[PDB]
Every structure is written in C-alpha cells, then in structure tokens.
Design a binder for this molecule. Structure first.
Ligand code: XQN
Ligand code: CL
Ligand code: NA
Ligand code: NA
Ligand code: NA
Length: 262
C-alpha cells in the first residue's frame, strides 16, 4: 500500500527522528519496508543473535546449555537485573540466554558473547545463516553508543526481519532449539510498551527490545495474530540528540500502521 508508506513517512516526520521498518507477512510472502536497507544501531535487539549462536552451538554439544558460568563482581556492567542476584555463584548458559532475552540483562549478553568466541563469532554466525548485513562489533555496554554515522553494532530492518524469520519460523535452528528461542522470546518482560502496544491485545508476540544512545528505541518481533499466519516485524528508531529520551510510542505507532487491515 502506498498509503502505509505515506503514514510511516508522516510518523517519522512528526517523531523528529529516523525510522526503519520491515514487516514480513507470511500469509502472502509480502513485505512493508521503510528505510529497510539503512543501518541502525541494534542495541539490545542484538541479544537474539547471540542467544541463537549459543543455541546453534548446542546442537552439537548436548551438555552445553547446562554448562555453568561464574558471575563475578568484575562482570557487572550497567544493567544486570538477573546477574546482580547471582554474584559469586554460577548461572547456566540456558539461564543466561533467558536472562538476556527476557530481562535484557547485559552481563548475560557478555557471557553469551564470550562463550561463542566474541563479537566477530556472533557476526560469523549471522553470515553462516545468510545474513551479510548484521555486524556485532563490541561487547556490553559500549555496543549501545548508537552514534549517527557509526556502522558498529548495526544492521538494517530488512536483514534483521529476514534473519528473525529464519530463526523463529524457518530452519536456521534445530527443532528443539527453535522452539526454545521462541519460548524465550514469548516470555520477554521488556516489550509491552513497544510493538505489542500497537497490536490487538489478543495477539501473541515474541519480541526483543533495544534502546541506547541518541534515544535509539528498537523492537523486533515474531507475531501470531488471531487466526492468521505469523508476521515478522522490525521497528528501529533513533534521534538527533545524544541524550534524547526513548520513544517506544513511535514503535507502537509503526506497528499499528503496518498491521492495520489484518
Ligand atoms: B538493551 O537495549 O536492553 C537493556 C534494557 N533497556 S531499558 O531501556 O533499560 C529497558 C526497557 C524496557 C524494560 Cl521493561 C526494562 C528496561 C539495556 C540496558 C542498557 C544498555 C542497553 C540495553
Ligand atoms: Cl484490543
Ligand atoms: Na540482521
Ligand atoms: Na513488543
Ligand atoms: Na530495551
């Protein structure tokens, strides 16, 4: 629809920032795209790719998710809601994956990153899946600086939507691992104000939010509408001012605009 395009342009204009949207509708294999090939800083939406990398590694290492990881005071960063409770103990890689995905715990992300070999290994995993756009450059918390013009720790909406489709609805991961990823994302606790706030209450969503510098406010989701084929939706947003506040309402509005009529 050209109208959906115009509506997203009007949202972007009023918001004052830069908006990126990619909707994949698996009912008819259609897409709605808005700046879908521009790069945006992923912030915490990158935790999906890190958890997925660990899950993939687990296909050939059955004990892997039960492996224990020490949590030290020296591991704490700037957002540790789960890990701060396990300092001087261990958490399993399953627990760290869930903490990263469902509470956006930054220590959990750093452990997933470390375990698979660092940011270039998470990036190599993306490449293995056919995503040649995703780049994870840094660890937490610096991967969230979201400086305009900086390509580090960025991807495009089109690439992340296609990759999220492969991960949650396709066959990137084994059946057990795919189910686990989707179960984790459906249990996310951080997304109610984002894409979910622009969709009917009856719809089931598995999402991962992100936020960071320059008021960057992001969400990526797999969506099961009532009695319809699933959707993938990426909404990326960032602003001109370094200390701009988050605008989750912009993502809810984009979600509402692109699902109107379904
Ligand atoms: B990353 O983008 O995710 C975490 C948490 N972000 S948040 O904005 O603090 C948030 C959003 C919604 C809820 Cl319900 C809770 C918390 C994070 C923290 C620091 C840097 C990057 C990320
Ligand atoms: Cl409703
Ligand atoms: Na991507
Ligand atoms: Na959401
Ligand atoms: Na977030």
């Amino acid at each position: 629809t050209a109208d959906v395009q115009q509506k997203l342009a009007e949202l972007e204009r009023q918001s004052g920032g830069r908006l990126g949207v990619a909707l994949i509708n698996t009912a008819d294999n259609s897409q709605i795209l808005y700046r879908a090939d521009e790069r945006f800083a992923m912030c915490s939406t990158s935790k999906v790719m890190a958890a997925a990398a660990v899950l993939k590694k687990s296909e050939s290492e059955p004990n892997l998710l039960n492996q224990r990881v020490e949590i030290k005071k020296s591991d704490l960063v700037n957002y540790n809601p789960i890990a701060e409770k396990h300092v001087n103990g261990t958490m399993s890689l399953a627990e760290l994956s869930a903490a990263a995905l469902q509470y956006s715990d930054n220590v959990a992300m750093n452990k997933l990153i470390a375990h698979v070999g660092g940011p270039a290994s998470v990036t190599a995993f993306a490449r293995q899946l056919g995503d040649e756009t995703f780049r994870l450059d840094r660890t937490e918390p610096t991967l969230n600086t979201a400086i305009p013009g900086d390509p580090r720790d960025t991807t495009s909406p089109r690439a992340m939507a296609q990759t999220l489709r492969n991960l949650t609805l396709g066959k990137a991961l084994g059946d057990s691992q795919r189910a686990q990823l989707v179960t984790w994302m459906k249990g996310n606790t951080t997304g109610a104000a984002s894409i979910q706030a622009g969709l009917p209450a009856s719809w089931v969503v598995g999402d991962k939010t992100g936020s960071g510098g320059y008021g960057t406010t992001n969400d990526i989701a797999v969506i099961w509408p009532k009695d319809r084929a699933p959707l993938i939706l990426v909404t990326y947003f960032t602003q001109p001012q370094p200390k701009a506040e988050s605008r989750r309402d912009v993502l809810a509005s984009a979600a509402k605009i692109v699902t109107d009529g379904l």
